[PDB]
Amino acid sequence: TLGAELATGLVFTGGAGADSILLGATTKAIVMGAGDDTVTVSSATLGAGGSVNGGDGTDVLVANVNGSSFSADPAFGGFETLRVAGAAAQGSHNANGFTALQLGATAGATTFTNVAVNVGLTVLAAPTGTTTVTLANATGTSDVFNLTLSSSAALAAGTVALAGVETVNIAATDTNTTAHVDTLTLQATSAKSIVVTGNAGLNLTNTGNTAVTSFDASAVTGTGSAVTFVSANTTVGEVVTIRGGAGADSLTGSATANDTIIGGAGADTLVYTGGTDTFTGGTGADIFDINAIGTSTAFVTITDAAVGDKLDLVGISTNGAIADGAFGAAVTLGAAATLAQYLDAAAAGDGSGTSVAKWFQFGGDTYVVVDSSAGATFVSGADAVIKLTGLVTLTTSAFATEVLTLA
């Protein structure tokens, strides 16, 4: 490995090993030989008589230039991977003739054009400006892209634009054993499925990705691999599924969607914003953050509330705050009582001054109500109802700053 750029008149001959050099506008026939070599160019066009061959092996050409189109230049050959990285790396780079793409530190926004099918991008260092991946042919109905984040420490991959791609696979990969969390802003307006894998966290900014109906990070491993996702789906009556991984995840649906959110292992936070949502915390002390009231027929159902889990109701205390204390006895009615009668009994009091919380059990499930209205009738859209699937006792569970911790 030589770190200083070779003089343009200097001949370099690599061997059967993995050699790495920097070139300018060379006037000589540079040969890298066998092995997986790496060549970093500071000029897209070599000098008169100059050429560089990557030789046998899987060879990396690093474009430290503002724009490149190496498949058009016969002076370059034998390079399988194209990396855009360097203090001058920038502009639009032709991916034709390359089977893999890489991205490092850059001087400004980078675009990969003519990206062939089954060609992935690996981000190795924080780039500058938006990275745009333009597929050679995105006309298909089922286009897939494999984006990889690979780093030893936390990697801010920046904004990556994948237009016309229907499935985005994101690998958040840690090369050492110390837990870290990557960040990424995904612009993929045609994506319907996002799948996250790897052994590192991912805080994914998802703004504008309105077609996603599936976020699957269930394969992510590592207790420290925190995954953060906020759904952007705005389709009326849409079904959306959001799965966390092994990490302490923060998963948020959308008000318009019927979100199925599954936290997986770890201390997960599942945020309810509206619709008919289904929350499964999984193992671990999970938090169900209730930020919208919902309606009497479109509310959240928590499938696995257990001792240790919490129920955050700060967002739904329309009037004042829910008083701190242990939950009293459940509301109990007659043998033929309906859910509507249970709802009215829970909301029979006056919540206009300060919202009150009550609970009951009906049909084999447990319900939590927040009454914020003076009337004796449950008011849909003003008073809230939360459903817990099993019969769970909330008698010894206490409210602390509007958070109920199951005991």
Least distance between Sr ion and beta carbon 228 (Å): 11
Taking CB under 5 A as the criterion, which residues in 91-110 touch Sr ion?
97
Between 176 and 297, CB nearer to Sr ion: 176
Sorted by sequence, the CB contacts under 8 Å of residue 190 that are 6+ apart come out as: 163, 164, 165, 166, 211
In contact, 345 and 333? CB cutoff 8 Å: yes
Other CB atoms within a 10 A radius of the CB of residue 48 amount to 9
Taking CB under 5 A as the criterion, which residues in 184-243 touch Sr ion?
none
Query: Applying CB under 5 A, which part among 109-117, 163-171, 214-222, 337-345 lies near Sr ion?
Result: 163-171
Please pick, from the candidates 218, 244, 270, 370, the single residue that binds Sr ion as defined by CB under 5 A.
Answer: 244
Least distance between Sr ion and beta carbon 197 (Å): 14
Query: Applying CB under 5 A, which part among 107-115, 218-226, 253-261, 329-337 lies near Sr ion?
Result: 253-261
Please pick, from the candidates 266, 358, 386, 394, the single residue that binds Sr ion as defined by CB under 5 A.
Answer: 266
Q: Cα separation of 60 and 23, whole Å?
A: 13
In contact, 23 and 45? CB cutoff 8 Å: no
Q: What tokens appear for 29 in the block?
A: 């026939």
Least distance between Sr ion and beta carbon 156 (Å): 14
Least distance between Sr ion and beta carbon 295 (Å): 12
Which strand (E) or helix (H) includes residue 290? Answer: strand 287-290
Please pick, from the candidates 1, 3, 4, 178, the single residue that binds Sr ion as defined by CB under 5 A.
Answer: 178
CA angle in degrees (0–180, nearest 5) for 194-126-66: 105
Burial letters 288-308, b for 16+ CB under 10 A, else e: bbbebbbebeebbbbebbbee
Q: Cα separation of 294 and 192, whole Å?
A: 26
Please pick, from the candidates 174, 182, 216, 238, the single residue that binds Sr ion as defined by CB under 5 A.
Answer: 174
Write the CA distances from 280 to 172, 197, 301, 341, 394, integer angstroms: 24, 20, 9, 27, 18
Q: What tokens appear for 128 in the block?
A: 């500058």
Query: Applying CB under 5 A, which part among 107-115, 256-264, 335-343, 390-398 lies near Sr ion?
Result: 256-264
Please pick, from the candidates 25, 138, 298, 339, the single residue that binds Sr ion as defined by CB under 5 A.
Answer: 138
Taking CB under 5 A as the criterion, which residues in 348-377 touch Sr ion?
351, 371, 373
Query: Applying CB under 5 A, which part among 3-11, 102-110, 158-166, 327-335 lies near Sr ion?
Result: 158-166
Taking CB under 5 A as the criterion, which residues in 20-39 touch Sr ion?
32-33, 35, 37
Q: Cα separation of 45 and 55, whole Å?
A: 19
Residue owning tokens 């008083």:
323
Write the CA distances from 220 to 160, 195, 207, 299, integer angstroms: 20, 10, 22, 29
Site string for Sr ion, 61-80 (x = CB under 5 A): ---------x--x--x-xx-
Q: Under the criterion CB under 5 A, does residue 182 sit at the interface with Sr ion?
A: no
In the complex, which residues of this chain contact Sr ion (CB under 5 A)? 14, 19, 32-33, 35, 37, 54-55, 57, 59, 70, 73, 76, 78-79, 97, 138, 140, 143, 164, 174, 176, 178, 180, 244, 249, 253, 257, 259, 263-264, 266, 268, 275, 277, 281-282, 284, 286, 289, 291, 309, 315, 317, 347, 351, 371, 373
